[PDB]
Structure formats: structure tokens, C-alpha cells
Amino acid sequence: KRNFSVTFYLSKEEHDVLRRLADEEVESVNSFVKRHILKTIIYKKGTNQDSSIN
Amino acid sequence: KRNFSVTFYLSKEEHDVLRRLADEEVESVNSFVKRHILKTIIYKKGTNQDSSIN
């Protein structure tokens, strides 16, 4: 198996907006950003699905 | 100002789709993802400075 990483930089206030929006539901900014990107691209997709986490 | 960083993982197919969608305009996939998040979260940011040099 393989994985395809993503890594970048942001402003103080931008990262703090992501931190607040994460902490409101899921206090893990990296997991929240991955979820944000996935949901904003597509929702209830048919290409693949899962029922567990790392 | 200081800078704040974000790191996570994607699957082969979703990263390859985002690589194609990036390559259509700005092939730097992590910059394309940064731009996607920024455009979704905010559209009237107060200032947009840069600090690059020769």
C-alpha cells in the first residue's frame, strides 16, 4: 500500500480560523483540513467508502 | 508576521485528480490545495504582502 502527502503554509489568523472551526467538532487541525477538502470537492460519493479510521 | 503550517495525507486517486485539476492552471498541487482552502474560507482578506528576493 501507498499514501500521497500534502504540506503547505498559512497566515496566523487563517490558521487560527481553521483551529477554531476544527475545535468546534474535531480538535485536530490536519484531520479537519483533510475532511474540509474532501467534503468541499464531493459528498456521499460512489467511487469508494469506509467505516473506520487510523 | 510569523507563518503557520499544515500537513496531512491523501489517497492515490484523490491526489492524482487534484494534480490534474492543479496542472490545468497551476501545477504546484500543495499551492492549488492552499488556494482551494483560502478561496472557500475567505474572499476579502485585508492585505496580501510578499517578501521574496533575488
Q: For residues A26 and A35, is the Cβ–Cβ distance under 8 A?
A: yes
Q: Report the run of H or E that residue B3 belongs to, with start and end.
A: strand B3-10
Q: What SS3 state is found at A11?
A: strand
**Method of determination used here:** NMR
Q: How far is CA B34 from the centre of its chain?
A: 2
Q: Is B41 on the interface with A (CB under 8 A)?
A: yes
As beta bridge partners, residue A6 has: B8
Task: Take residue A5 and report the three cell numbers written for it.
Answer: 502527502
Is A33 in CB contact (< 8 Å) with chain B?
yes
C-alpha to C-alpha distance for A49 and B8, rounded to whole angstroms: 19
B38 in reach of chain A (CB within 8 A) = yes
DSSP symbol at A25 = T
B1-54 placed in CATH 1.20.1440.130: no
Residue A34 sits at the vertex; the CA angle it makes with A53 and A22, to the nearest 5 degrees, is: 95
Q: Give first-to-last CA distance, chain A, whole Å.
A: 14
